[PDB]
């Protein structure tokens, strides 16, 4: 109809209720489920769907062997109905590639997929299910993007890309697209020293992205974007409640404009909702591996370098595998506020479970409640032994 | 379009004709059919569909082992086209949880799923396929609901929940929702001493629910709701034709305001149509197990403590497994009256058929005819031996 | 929109072109295809689809054992997209039963399914996908109907049923339905002595049904219906080109008002287009079994007792299995005439191929061309050996 | 809405970006994927889909044995969602036959399928999913057509057929259809000596077809059609950059009006975009087999007999199997120009990989970019060893 505008503020997050779970690995043990990774969730005005990077093979198929690898010519961004698994028969291909982002602007959807060899990748921007724009690698080193939904405001949908080293300074750009065409792009500015896989959400005409400093930071970099002025700033979450993984143990004071040191060249895509006292952080429970997952209310996390949790909710037990996590919201829901949501990728197989030769995942996602709901844990649920 | 209003009375029930049967277990022996239980049927203005609680695995899948269990993080309310089986590929997830209800109000559908551990469950009310309201456990003991469709009138859709003991007095509430939001809730009142899994239907602006007294009653409690005044009453079916299972043998006089004694802490979800002489009761044939199923015309069953059958129809032979049963009607059919319908859950596997490690079911459903139709029996039809 | 009216005459049939083929048995050797029989084809104003009586199991499934049997509680009328096979995932159940008919009246579709034991069957008439009317067995001996599409004119859709003996005189009725309700019914009149499984089509406000005299006739009975007056007549195809199976060898003169003798108590559902010189007859090639299939132009077959072929076209070789055949036309096609069409059921398995324990079929269908097209044969194509 | 008119010119082709890839053979190793060959891509105003000639069996099915053969009664033109594989469950049959073409005219789609024995084939033209016209073989020798999409302009959709010898002069005709009816047909004229499988595209009211001279030419014949005048001309691509396969090595001067000699009676369906300096040619890398695939910018290839490449892009490595290739464009995209696209059939199995008994393929397709994008190779990706 008309372009959606971020006119509402976030609803108060007093807890998280279950939104979707596909039990993909369990079900795929005996049905035609595609092997995937790098999932996310994104809504259209009339429907919300699961998204992910297929590996171009079923889990039980012999080609599942080797799916731990990230970039092949057999990957593609696919979407499928909420809480269903990604099967060969219900998965809709949005585009071909090994890194992506996607978002609806109110009128139609923009999907971006990047493909290519390491030194010659290219992004192709699709809008209304047609290819519209293409961007060639600028640093010749794995051009890559969010791996979660982008956000739009009055037709403008900013997307953060990175090209160059993952263990050194790199060339990050914020592109502002409208109807799949480039209106403008900027180099990253601010104090964030390295950006990877941004998780974004919008409220009251501002887009907040919580990303990953793969190079040095265990605290998360944050990019706040003004989609009207088409400008942005960057910093780190000040809080001592560190949210990357692997990471050092929590200090009593964090860092606002530098990476918090202790762990280099590694990290996991994650997210957060930064809204004054209504601030919640997601992180794996383990400081060593992609294990477990919890949500922590850390009032003023972004700006208070001594902020510590005041409430919390466990999502996945530390005795269960987790993985990537990101944000999305249904901007077309009824009500006066935007209900914060997120998904957690539950990785199974390699590298942690090497008795099988594949790597895949299932998805669990939650949204906020203004109630103070009882909590439960949500594991993948599959028995690797069955696959042997 | 506009909210549906219960303006018609029931059609005269002279017999029952076959409406839907999915042969799920038979078909699932060699195709991707989800393991389910707690099925039901519910109509939208333009389509009627089967519903059930998936177990998050196929019947032939190795994860089918253990599906006798009731509440896991892998369950979800799913719906699929009438008389098809619930397959991995045609099943639509309405919400995540291990207890549910759902109904269309004329404009859109409300679905409710409860999930959580035993002492910390929570219901989340979905409307127009979006989460709208959440209710936290009030008694911290398996918050649970109908397991069959709710009914709406002018936007108001009452739902009966129970929280607390299943073998003692508990905290039952009647919630009145409108567009997924709570307008009001009451504690259970009347003479019903314990309520579990209500089966409901509406006619001439009154909603009748036949439930289950798991604690002491072999006769069924009944909750009649006024969705305009948003008030209700409760009593038991007076008839000596006892309809719970397990149950004592039929007496010559029943009880109107107390459970009929003889069997404690057990029962099966069931239903009835209470309409003066046009009154029909469903019950298993066996007084000992979920075996067989028959419909009995017991004029004035609700109010006459000596009422006995005047007509009958066998649905499932006592030599075949049955299970839960509930009511639904197509409130959007043509005609001057509402045609009473019901479904019977045909449980296969555990606990009665323990040579297999799973528990699932198929569905058979009938609707009334003003004709006096010949009868046939409708078993599940699968051979357990094939699954070994 | 508006009720369709049979305002056109048939197009000139100079040959038959391929219309649809599903290769169901071939494909089903390694995919989830339902076992079926008694197929047909029927069009809606915007789509034409294949129809059949499922057996409630896949071909490779263990429950396929025994599918030679005709009436079980596991059968249902299903429809699916033209030329696709009937799979567990794309098949839409129209109703439950072991005998059926279906037709679109221009506004919506009427489907009829009969179920029950031999002495207590009942038909239930569905309209706009809802149950509307029910008819109880009148002779208590396998109430049964067409097994191919009915035809409508200004809302009136006549259907021929038979109840009683298949090897003696029986009680055949012509029902005239409108919006799923009975307007009127007649007993069979005319000279046809026994009616089974009528194949019908309409043109210029007249409905012609070519049926099967299972009792004594090797020539086919024909019922012509006036859907406005709601009256009919019956006779036999006069032609010596006998079209039932099994059958005696062709004589030089046929019979107009009596069964042509030579074979008792057996026959196959078949059809014909009776239109003066534009008359074509379908029949198996073998006079002994459901083997092969050919179309023969026999000018004035209905009324000329010495009529012999003037042109012909082989559809299936005598070295391939055939089965039932019936008529349908797309009454919503462009043009000034109705293009005659038909389908042939290609039965595989039992009883002729007993190395397998199942019985199923695939479908091939053709429509007429005003061209004189080259011919090809269209077998099922599956290798039974593969199923062993 | 209204008939589409070729009002735009081609966009400048500076490189090719990835458009679609279905990874069919990989995925089909463990899921219900139909065996196919002779694929292509074609767009409707609201969707673009993959097309191909199914073999009426899955790849893993036992009937896959023998699929190297070209014409059987089990083949059919099927279409399915872009980048999905052709599965038994998502494939839509357009018509029955072993040679086809299809195109949307703006209002609805025309599909053509030819079937029959070698000496008695016939084409049947479908429009709006209904059969409309039929054409009988004129030379009684494998009537056949494009195997890729046709193109329409103001309702007129020309199609090139060939009937007669594939290794000698034959009878090629250009038919001009409108709403599935024949407006006119011509015999082939010009200097092209033999025409097989034309690949076409349209721009500024002219339709260009790059075909295959199976008889003598290693350079490609080209048919340019005026769909308004309904007239055409024919010649060969003048360029010494030979694009058929097998073929001699490139000379320094090509031939404009005769086949370039060196290889007889063989060839592969291919294509090209002939647009002055914006001219690109596709060809296999190997001059001996259907191996590898590259795009070469050969300014003025059609008219300059000494034209050599000025830019290039590898699509498939010479160490990977390729096959047929053809053109299509989305005539309903936004923008001021038509973006040239093409697909490459990646054949697997027989005859080159004879350890398996089947022959199938997967599809990769690209479209042009005005950017100078980095290149990657796009192989089928399946391991034949897995199928053994
Ligand atoms: C039914 O459901 C309800 C609803 O969920 C249940 O009630 C919930 O119970 C939760 C668990 O108790 C509770 O969650 C906790 O909240 C704490 C904050 O609340 C308390 O403090 C505030 C502030 O003063 C008070 O207002 C309040 O009254 C409470 O006293 C959090 O602090 C908790 O998180 C911390 O502990 C968990 C382990 O429990 C860690 O995993 C987590 O990371 C937090 O601790 C680490 O991080 C901090 C900050 O740096 C460190 O100080 C600390 O040492 C830990 O650090 C180590 O561990 C981390 C992670 O491994 C590592 O990185 C680091 O290096 C160190 O090794 C927790 O979130 C809910 O708030 C509460 N909800 C409600 C509404 O009440 C109820 O129990 C359920 N009922 C039943 C019967 O079960
Ligand atoms: C073709 O189709 C038609 C249409 O269906 C067939 O006709 C139908 O035939 C049915 C079976 O005969 C018949 O059903 C019965 O109707 C009885 C009522 O009708 C009779 O009584 C009235 C009242 O005076 C008369 O008007 C009427 O003319 C008849 O005489 C029911 O009473 C029957 O139910 C009872 O019996 C069945 C077993 O048959 C039990 O399973 C059932 O539970 C009922 O009996 C138990 O319950 C009562 C009440 O408490 C007890 O008194 C009794 O002892 C039984 O109790 C034991 O068993 C129960 C259950 O196990 C247990 O809980 C308890 O503790 C005790 O152990 C039955 O419903 C249809 O009405 C009739 N329909 C029509 C339209 O005619 C026709 O036969 C078919 N044709 C062919 C050729 O087959
Ligand atoms: C390319 O394609 C074209 C287009 O299809 C091919 O041309 C077609 O060729 C067809 C086969 O030749 C041909 O079909 C036949 O037509 C005959 C009628 O035409 C002839 O007679 C008329 C009338 O005088 C002439 O006008 C005309 O010029 C011809 O001379 C039919 O009579 C044929 O059917 C009979 O034979 C077939 C076997 O071929 C039987 O299966 C069939 O049942 C018919 O014969 C039985 O029935 C009759 C009637 O009672 C009996 O008299 C006779 O003895 C047979 O009876 C026995 O067999 C039956 C069945 O088993 C059994 O019940 C009974 O008891 C007895 O045992 C046949 O239909 C097409 O018309 C023709 N089409 C066109 C447009 O030309 C062309 O060949 C192809 N090209 C190539 C290169 O292959
Ligand atoms: C990142 O991505 C970019 C973007 O893709 C990469 O840059 C691209 O690199 C490509 C490969 O180098 C390049 O493709 C070539 O372009 C040549 C034309 O450019 C050159 O010549 C022009 C003209 O003077 C200059 O303007 C220009 O500056 C260049 O110098 C083509 O000529 C190339 O094709 C020929 O070679 C390939 C093998 O490389 C053959 O397969 C192909 O068939 C061509 O050669 C055959 O055909 C010709 C013509 O008849 C014969 O003369 C020749 O002998 C060969 O003939 C034999 O082989 C054929 C086929 O087997 C056989 O039939 C015959 O009988 C003989 O046996 C090639 O297309 C892109 O243009 C370039 N793109 C851009 C934008 O720059 C970049 O490298 C990537 N980066 C990294 C780090 O990898
Ligand atoms: C088929 O015939 C009936 C007439 O018998 C047509 O019905 C008339 O249609 C118009 C528009 O619907 C009404 O105003 C008339 O009263 C209708 N009916 C009768 C029964 O008189 C019908 O429109 C015809 N069908 C089609 C497709 O033209
Ligand atoms: C393509 O060209 C034809 C004109 O040749 C356009 O047809 C005219 O369209 C309008 C609206 O449909 C009619 O009133 C004219 O009479 C049409 N036709 C002719 C043949 O004169 C057509 O609209 C054009 N297509 C598009 C998408 O614009
Ligand atoms: C931070 C992005 N990088 C470094 C290039 C990664 O390796 C990502 O790591 C992971 C990962 O789980 O750590 C998954 C993604 N598939 C990778 N992205 C790409 C484009 O390969
Ligand atoms: C009466 C409801 N209760 C007691 C909590 C049950 O155990 C139900 O029993 C049965 C049952 O078949 O008896 C099935 C339901 N899955 C159970 N419901 C829940 C929420 O677990
Ligand atoms: C002529 C109809 N009769 C006799 C009842 C049949 O047996 C039919 O035979 C055949 C048949 O292939 O001969 C198939 C049908 N499934 C049967 N119909 C029913 C209702 O069982
Ligand atoms: C050039 C067309 N001809 C000669 C008849 C072919 O054999 C084609 O060859 C090939 C081929 O891959 O060479 C595939 C097509 N399936 C064939 N077409 C038909 C109609 O059989
Ligand atoms: C395939 O067919 C050939 C030829 O009929 C036969 O020899 C061969 O054994 C078959 N192979 C398989 C695997 O069926
Ligand atoms: Ca399988
Ligand atoms: Ca890090
Ligand atoms: Ca009880
Ligand atoms: Ca007979
Ligand atoms: Ca050639």
Residue D27: which of A88, A115, A137 has the nearest Cβ? A88
Q: DSSP letter at D25?
A: H
Are D32 and C29 inside 8 Å of each other by CB? Answer: no
Chain B contact set for C72 (CB, 8 A): 381
Class of residue C30 by CB neighbours under 10 A (exposed 0-12, middle 13-18, buried 19+): buried
Q: Which experimental approach was used here?
A: X-ray
Q: In whole angstroms, what is the distance from residue C125 CA to residue C133 CA?
A: 5
Q: Tell me D12's DSSP state.
A: P
Residue from A275, A137, A120, A139 nearest A210 by CA: A275
Contacts made by residues D204-210, CB under 8 angstroms, sequence distance 24+: D204/D6, D204/D7, D204/D8, D204/D9, D205/D5, D205/D6, D205/D7, D205/D153, D206/D6, D207/D6, D207/D151, D207/D153, D207/D158, D208/D273, D208/D274, D209/D160, D210/D237, D210/D270, D210/D271, D210/D272, D210/D274, D210/D327
Q: Are the beta carbons of B151 and B159 closer than 8 angstroms?
A: no
Q: Nearest 10 degrees: CA dihedral of D209, D215, D219, D224?
A: -20
**Can you tell me which atom of ligand 5 is nearest the CA of C1?**
27
Q: At a CB cut-off of 8 Å and minimum separation 6, what does A315 contact?
A: A16, A282, A293, A294, A295, A344, A364, A366, A377, A378
- Asked whether A293 and A325 are in contact (CB, 8 A), the reply is yes
For chain C, the straight-line distance linking the first and the last C-alpha, in angstroms and rounded, comes to: 51
Distance A4 CA to ligand 3 centre (A): 70
Mutation choice for ligand 4 from D238, D250, D371, CB with most ligand atoms inside 8 A: D250
Q: A277 burial class (0-12, 13-18, 19+ CB within 10 angstroms)?
A: exposed
User: Min CA distance, A355 vs chain B (Å)?
Assistant: 17
SS3 string, C225-267, reads EECCCCEEEEEECCCCCCCCCCCCCCCCCCCCCCCCCCCCCCC
Domain at D311, CATH number: 2.120.10.10
Q: Is residue B326 within 8 Å of B40, Cβ to Cβ?
A: yes
Residues found in chain C: 388
A333-353: string of b/e by CB count within 10 Å (b at 16+)? beeeebbbbbbbbbbbbbeee
- Asked if residues D248 and D260 have their Cβ atoms less than 8 Å apart, the reply is yes
Report helix, strand or coil for C385: helix
Write out chain C residues lying below 8 Å of D71, CB-based. Answer: none
CB neighbourhood size of B333 (10 A): 18
Query: Dihedral of CA A148/A153/A154/A159: which sign?
Result: negative
CA gap D179, D154 in Å, rounded: 11
Residue spans of beta strands (DSSP E) within C44-91? 48-58, 76-81
Alpha carbons B94 and B112: distance in angstroms, whole number: 8
Distance CA(B350)–CA(B358), nearest Å, equals 6
Give the gap in angstroms from C-alpha D90 to the nearest C-alpha of chain A: 7
Judge contact between C167 and B367, C-beta under 8 A: no
Please list all protein residues whose beta carbon sits less than 5 angstroms from ligand 16, which is an ion: D 244, 267
Between the alpha carbon of residue C55 and those of residues A99, B155, B315, C270, the distances in Å are 46, 42, 20, 22
Q: How do beta strands B337-338 and B9-10 pair?
A: parallel
Check residue A27 and report its DSSP letter: H
Ligand 7 near A144 CB (within 6 A): yes
Residue length of chain D: 388
Q: Which residues of B touch C73 (CB under 8 A)?
A: 21, 376-379, 381
| For the CA of C117, the nearest ligand | 2
User: Contact A120/D374, CB-based, under 8 Å?
Assistant: yes
Q: What SS3 class is residue D58? A: strand
Tell me if chain D has a CB within 8 Å of the CB of C383: yes
Rounded CA separation C366/C274 (Å): 17
B41 interfacial to chain C (CB closer than 8 Å): no
Spatial separation of the C-alpha atoms in residues D361 and D347, rounded to whole Å: 4
**B228 min Cα distance to partner chain C (Å):** 29
Q: What is the residue with the minimal CA distance to atom 17 of ligand 8?
A: B70
Ligand sitting nearest the alpha carbon of D66: 11
On the question of a cis peptide bond just before residue C351, with omega within 30 degrees of 0, the verdict is: yes
Task: Count other C-beta atoms under 10 Å from residue B167's C-beta.
Answer: 12
Substitution site in B263, B283, B284, B296 for ligand 2 pocket (most atoms within 8 Å of beta carbon): B296
Q: What are the angstrom distances between the C-alpha of A361 and each of A22, A77, B101?
A: 10, 15, 30
Note if C324 is an active site residue. yes
Say how far apart CA C2 and CA C104 lie, in whole Å.
Answer: 12
Residue A386 belongs to what H/E stretch? Answer: helix A384-387
**DSSP H stretches of helix in C14-163:** 24-27
Please tell me the distance from the alpha carbon of residue C99 to that of residue C106, in angstroms, as a whole number: 23
Interface test with D, best of A28, A54, A57, A141 (most D CBs within 10 A): A57
* Rama region for B4: left / alpha / beta (φ>0; ψ in -120 to 50; rest): beta
Question: Which residues have C-beta under 5 Å from ligand 13, the single-atom ion?
Answer: A 244, 267
Buried b (16+ CB within 10 A) or exposed e, A13-50: bbbbbbbbbbbbbbbbbbbbbbbbbbbbbbbbeeebbb
Q: How many helices (H) and strands (E) does chain A have?
A: 2, 25
Catalytic position from the list A175, A260, A324, A338: A324
Q: How many CB atoms lie within 10 A of CB C372?
A: 13
Count the alpha carbons within 13 Å of D53 in the hemisphere toward its beta carbon: 28
CA nearest D307: which of D315, D316, D298? D298
User: Which of B369, B332, B338, B365 has the alpha carbon at shortest distance from B41?
Assistant: B365
**DSSP category for residue C350:** T
Answer for the pair B151, B326: CB distance below 8 angstroms, yes or no: no
* Alpha carbon separation from D337 to A238, A290, C140 (Å, rounded): 50, 48, 71
B374, C121 in Cβ contact below 8 A? yes
Nearest CB partner across the interface for C58, out of B31, B82, B83: B31
Instruction: Give residues 125 to 164 of D whose Cβ lies within 8 Å of C.
Output: 128-132, 134-137
Q: How many CB pairs under 8 A join B and C?
A: 118
**Residue C173 CA from chain centroid, whole number:** 17
Q: Are C345 and C323 in contact (CB under 8 A)?
A: yes
DSSP SS3 for C42: strand
Contacts of D56 in chain C (CB under 8 A): 23, 26-27, 381
Q: What is the number of structural domains in chain D?
A: 1
Secondary-structure percent of chain D, ordered helix, strand, coil, rounded to 5: 5, 45, 50
C-alpha dihedral (B344, B283, B338, B12), degrees to nearest 10: 130
What letter would DSSP give residue A269? -
What domain range includes position D377? Answer: 1-388
- In Å, the largest CA–CA distance within chain B is 55
Cα angle B331, B337, B342 (rounded to 5 degrees) comes to: 55
Residue A369 vs residues A284, A327, A341, B132: alpha-carbon distances, Å: 21, 15, 10, 9
CB-based contacts of C361: which residues, under 8 Å, 6+ apart?
A: C24, C25, C36, C37, C39, C52, C323, C345, C346, C347, C348, C380
Query: How many angstroms separate the CA atoms of C244 and C236, rounded?
Result: 12
| Cross-strand bridge partners of residue C282 | C295
Residues of A whose CB is below 8 A from D19? 96, 131
Under DSSP, the state recorded for D385 is H
Task: Give just the sign of the alpha carbon dihedral B158, B160, B161, B164.
Answer: positive
d(CA B326, CA B342): 5
User: Which listed residue (C32, C44, C70, C226) is catalytic?
Assistant: C70
**What is the maximum alpha-carbon separation in chain C?**
55
C103, C150 in Cβ contact below 8 A? yes
Residue of the nearest CA to atom 12 in ligand 5?
A: C2
Ligand 6 near D84 CB (within 6 A): no
| 3 state SS of D24 | helix
Q: What residue's CA is closest to ligand 4, atom 68?
A: D312
């Amino acid at each position: 109809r008309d372009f959606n505008n971020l006119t509402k503020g976030l609803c108060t997050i007093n807890s998280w209720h279950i939104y979707g779970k596909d039990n993909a690995v369990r079900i795929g043990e005996d049905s035609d489920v595609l092997v995937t990774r790098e999932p996310y969730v994104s809504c259209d005005p009339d429907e919300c769907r699961f998204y992910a990077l297929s590996q171009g093979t079923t889990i039980r198929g012999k080609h599942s062997n080797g799916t731990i690898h990230d970039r092949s010519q057999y990957r593609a961004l696919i979407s499928w109905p909420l809480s269903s698994p990604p099967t060969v028969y219900n998965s809709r291909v949005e585009c071909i590639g090994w890194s992506s982002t996607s978002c609806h602007d109110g009128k139609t959807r923009m999907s971006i997929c990047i493909s290519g060899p390491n030194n010659n990748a290219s992004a192709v921007i699709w809008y209304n299910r047609r290819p519209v724009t293409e961007i060639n690698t600028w640093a010749r080193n794995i051009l890559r993007t969010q791996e979660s939904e982008c956000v739009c405001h009055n037709g403008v949908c900013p997307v953060v890309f990175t090209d160059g080293s993952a263990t050194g300074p790199a060339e990050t750009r914020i592109y502002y697209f409208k109807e799949g065409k480039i209106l403008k792009w900027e180099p990253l500015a601010g104090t964030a020293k390295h950006i990877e896989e941004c998780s974004c959400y919008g409220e009251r005409a501002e887009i907040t992205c919580t990303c990953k400093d793969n190079w040095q930071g265990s605290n998360r970099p944050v990019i706040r974007i003004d989609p009207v002025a088409m400008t942005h700033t960057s910093q780190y979450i000040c809080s001592p409640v560190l949210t990357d993984n692997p990471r050092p143990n929590d200090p009593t004071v964090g860092k606002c404009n530098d990476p918090y040191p202790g762990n280099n060249n590694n990290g996991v895509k994650g997210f957060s909702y930064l809204d004054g006292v209504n601030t919640w952080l997601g992180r794996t429970i383990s400081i060593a591996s992609r294990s477990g997952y919890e949500m922590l209310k850390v009032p003023n996390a972004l700006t208070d370098d001594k902020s510590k949790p005041t409430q919390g909710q466990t999502i996945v037990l530390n005795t269960d595998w987790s993985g990537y996590s990101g944000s999305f919201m249904d901007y077309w829901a009824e009500g006066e506020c935007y209900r914060a949501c997120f998904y957690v990728e539950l990785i199974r197989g390699r590298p942690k479970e090497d008795k099988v030769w594949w790597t895949s995942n299932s998805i669990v996602s939650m949204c906020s409640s203004t109630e103070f709901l009882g909590q439960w844990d949500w594991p993948d649920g599959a028995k690797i032994e069955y696959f042997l």
